[PDB]
Each structure stands twice: as structure tokens, then as C-alpha cells.
């Protein structure tokens, strides 16, 4: 129980709509309240969103960043407020391979959690 | 059911031993057969592991890479063979902070599964 903030870089691109909407739905299925914050590819809007999320005292943040400067600053602010952040994105490697990524500074000491998540992801993929 | 390959960069460090053991246990709990391949910090052995995994027809790969550049080529070969890869690792970011990473060649077009996993990570962290 608690509330999770879903911060998405945009909602005019389908990949991000699916990401934001599915994350909200899964949080609600697990017993959380969840709200989507749309940064609209704007640094100031993303920063304003973190202002409200920190003020509201959300329990966790699912964060799709708009860049690699103001966004890491916003993550730092959430950490100082004691709010864990789990970042989600997709990118293209130097050789062209596209990869979808989840990362977080919270769980580096928890190999059991990371192993279970990776296997559960593979399981959901294979069974569908 | 199915069969997953667990490719670990080394079995000479506790974090990686626990990672590999837990991945094998979780795969079995979820109804899969699982096999561990120890790369022993050797890109040649990692590549040879992917050689045998592709030939054996594994259904999924849980991948802890030895290197950043050379190991991405193994993710390509698996994708070329139609085997989905789910990578788990830890790195040091540009600000010098340790970061835990889970990533895949899947969910780059329809990220429903990755979205759910990110929320489950947060939930398990909170509980």
C-alpha cells in the first residue's frame, strides 16, 4: 500500500503511452494509488513534476527521463527526500541494437531480488 | 514448460554466485529447467557459452555480461537465433554511482512486460 508516481517523458509517442499506462495499471493491481505525470519533453515541466511528487510524499517513482542532465538532477532530489526511483527507458546501442532498460541505484546490494526479477520477466515473456 | 540458460560472468565473487543460484531456483519454481554457464571473466568462454546455448535451443537467456562491448555482440547472436535475452548487471554511472540494471532486447516496441516489471521491482523493494 502507498502511492507511486509514473513520470513519462511524453504521451504523444505510443511506446511511452503503453509504458505509462501499463505501469499505472500494474501499480493499482498491486494495491497502490498511481498517477501519471507527463513531462511533454520539457525540462521545466519534469522538474515541476518532481516538485509536486516530493511535496506529496510519494512512496516510489517510475521515471522515464527527458534527458541526461536535468533528469539526473531530479533523481538526486528524490533521493534526498528518501523516495526510491526506478528508471525506465529504451535506447539504440552503438551498433544499432535496441534495448529496453530498467535501472535504479536502490538495489545494488540485493542480488536475490535482481535475479528473481530477470527470471520473472523471461517467464512472462515466454508464457505470452 | 521450458529451459533457461543462466550465463554468469564469474563464480568467484559472492554477489554473482548468489545471483546465479537465485536465478536457477526461481526458474525451477516457475516451472523451467535451468543451466548455469560460468564465463570466468573470459569473453572467449562467454562467447563459447552462447555457441552451445544457441545450438541447444534454449528458450531464454538470463545474461550477466563480462564486458560492455563484446557481450552486446552475444545478445545480437541470440536475437538472430530467436532467443530472448534478459540481462542483469551493475555498473558505475557518470556521476560515479553504482546502479542496478535489468535490460532486454524485448519490450523495445511494446513495453507492457517491462513496465509491469519496473513496478514489481518498486513494490518488492518497498516490501
Residue numbers in the entry:
A (entry chain C): 1 to 128
B (entry chain A): 1 to 127
Give excerpts from the publication.
Periplasmic binding proteins (PBPs) are a class of proteins that participate in the cellular transport of various ligands. The structurally symmetric bilobal architecture of their fold has long been thought to originate from a duplication and fusion event of an individual lobe. Here, the crystal structures of two permuted halves of a modern ribose-binding protein (RBP) from Thermotoga maritima are reported.
